[PDB]
Amino acid sequence: EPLHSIISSTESVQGSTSKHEFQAETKKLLDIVARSLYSEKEVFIRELISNASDALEKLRHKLVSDGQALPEMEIHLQTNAEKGTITIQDTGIGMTQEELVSNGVGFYSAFMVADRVEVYSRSAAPGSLGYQWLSDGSGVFEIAEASGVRTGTKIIIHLKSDCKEFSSEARVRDVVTKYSNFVSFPLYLNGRRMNTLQAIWMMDPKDVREWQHEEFYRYVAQAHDKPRYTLHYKTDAPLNIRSIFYVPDMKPSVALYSRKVLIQTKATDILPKWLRFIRGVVDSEDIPSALIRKLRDVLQQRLIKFFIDQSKKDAEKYAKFFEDYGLFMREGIVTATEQEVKEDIAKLLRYESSALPSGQLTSLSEYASRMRAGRNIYYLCAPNRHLAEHSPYYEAMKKKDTEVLFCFEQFDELTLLHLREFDKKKLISVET
Numbered sequence: 289e290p291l292h293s294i295i296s297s298t299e300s301v302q303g304s305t306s307k308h309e310f311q312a313e314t315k316k317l318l319d320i321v322a323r324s325l326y327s328e329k330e331v332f333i334r335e336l337i338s339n340a341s342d343a344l345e346k347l348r349h350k351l352v353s354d355g356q357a358l359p360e361m362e363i364h365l366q367t368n369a370e371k372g373t374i375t376i377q378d379t380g381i382g383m384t385q386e387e388l389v390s391n392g393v394g395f396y397s398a399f400m401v402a403d404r405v406e407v408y409s410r411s412a413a414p415g416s417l418g419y420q421w422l423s424d425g426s427g428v429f430e431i432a433e434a435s436g437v438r439t440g441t442k443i444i445i446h447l448k449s450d451c452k453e454f455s456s457e458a459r460v461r462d463v464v465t466k467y468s469n470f471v472s473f474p475l476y477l478n479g480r481r482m483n484t485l486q487a488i489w490m491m492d493p494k495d496v497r498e499w500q501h502e503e504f505y506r507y508v509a510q511a512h513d514k515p516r517y518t519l520h521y522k523t524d525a526p527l528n529i530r531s532i533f534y535v536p537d538m539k540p541s542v543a544l545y546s547r548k549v550l551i552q553t554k555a556t557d558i559l560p561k562w563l564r565f566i567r568g569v570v571d572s573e574d575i576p577s578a579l580i581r582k583l584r585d586v587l588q589q590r591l592i593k594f595f596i597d598q599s600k601k602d603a604e605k606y607a608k609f610f611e612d613y614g615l616f617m618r619e620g621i622v623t624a625t626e627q628e629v630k631e632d633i634a635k636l637l638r639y640e641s642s643a644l645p646s647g648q649l650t651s652l653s654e655y656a657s658r659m660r661a662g663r664n665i666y667y668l669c670a671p672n673r674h675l676a677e678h679s680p681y682y683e684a685m686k687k688k689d690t691e692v693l694f695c696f697e698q699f700d701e702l703t704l705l706h707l708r709e710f711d712k713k714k715l716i717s718v719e720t
């Protein structure tokens with residue numbers, strides 16, 4: 289068995305610790321984080337991992353920048369049921385003495401579950417001394433020079449009396465696989481490797497290719513088919529977004545990460561209700577019921593444009609897509625309030641036309657681009673094609689030289705009825 293242990297008692301303090309009042313901001317902040325900020329107390333494990341990752345990254349960066357060799361870059365967790373402790377060490381960039389004295393606020397979440405926190409840290413900088421940092425989370429911490437400290441940071445948590453659960457390996461394992469499956473550096477628990485998954489949404493879209501997208505699709509959608517559609521969307525311009533969206537090839541939710549770190553597996557609010565058929569992940573740093581709105585919209589127009597290009601890249605596959613998911617588009621159109629929201633989604637609708645061969649579809653805008661200036665969009669629900677063609681109501685439009693849209697289902701017609709008007713033109717039935 290591949291048992292990797294890097295965690296042991298090498299640290300010793302020769303002198304005495306100097307005592308140290310928190311600054312008036314930090315006392316209140318610590319209590320806010322430890323007693324209010326988070327709703328689930330397990331997330332401390334999450335936060336401490338995040339920090340660890342960060343440390344490691346800038347270490348890595350730094351070294352690769354200076355152009356020197358890379359050491360072991362790992363994150364280790366150790367549980368101890370009888371000392372009743374949980375420990376997290378990283379071999380990343382450490383903390384200088386000033387960095388410890390002065391100030392990664394997620395760290396303080398540790399005091400949500402601990403009644404004493406014990407830290408050993410040593411900067412990666414050349415000729416850096418190790419230091420010990422101690423605190424009961426009141427208003428007093430202690431600082432002392434320590435020896436036998438490895439480069440990086442070791443955080444030892446002495447759990448509260450009824451928080452002993454986080455000294456159990458099974459519990460901690462569950463928490464880890466829950467929030468930290470996609471950690472960017474190798475993570476071990478009690479000697480055993482945990483994370484195997486690659487946060488492929490952080491990648492460059494050009495560097496990810498099919499088998500990866502399939503693996504991840506099956507992961508987040510918990511499915512066995514393949515995605516029929518794939519949109520890898522990165523942006524920094526409006527807000528920060530690293531997202532992947534899949535449309536299942538089976539005919540009939542998105543996870544919210546930030547930090548390559550899970551926040552909610554069921555982010556139903558991140559996409560509009562009519563795009564609930566979409567699978568995948570949204571990763572955004574601008575995420576602490578308002579900005580989620582901002583993001584939800586941003587994703588909505590992004591996805592709409594996506595499906596439009598999909599139409600104009602492969603109209604037959606998109607035709608099938610409209611047959612399998614048009615339900616959601618009609619629902620979303622009727623559901624919308626502001627008009628051109630309705631029209632935006634309406635750009636995804638595909639219907640048969642009198643000026644098109646029976647079987648072929650077009651959109652409203654396509655229709656309009658052949659609509660001779662002069663003002664109205666004509667449609668008609670018949671049971672089938674040839675019945676619409678032989679409707680007197682249409683045969684009044686045949687030699688009147690006008691194109692007419694053909695619906696074959698009541699929900700389509702109700703949709704166009706609700707829509708009322710689309711871009712500088714109203715939708716009228718030829719039975720009016």
Ligand SMILES: CC(C)NCCCn1c(Sc2cc3c(cc2I)OCO3)nc2c(N)ncnc21
Pocket residue numbers: 339340343378380381382383387388391392393395407421440441
């Ligand atoms: C390098 C440092 C300036 N980055 C700021 C975040 C501080 N920090 C943190 S959060 C933190 C941790 C503390 C602390 C204050 C913070 I904020 O006092 C006792 O230990 N974790 C780090 C880690 N594993 N490696 C390197 N730095 C860490």
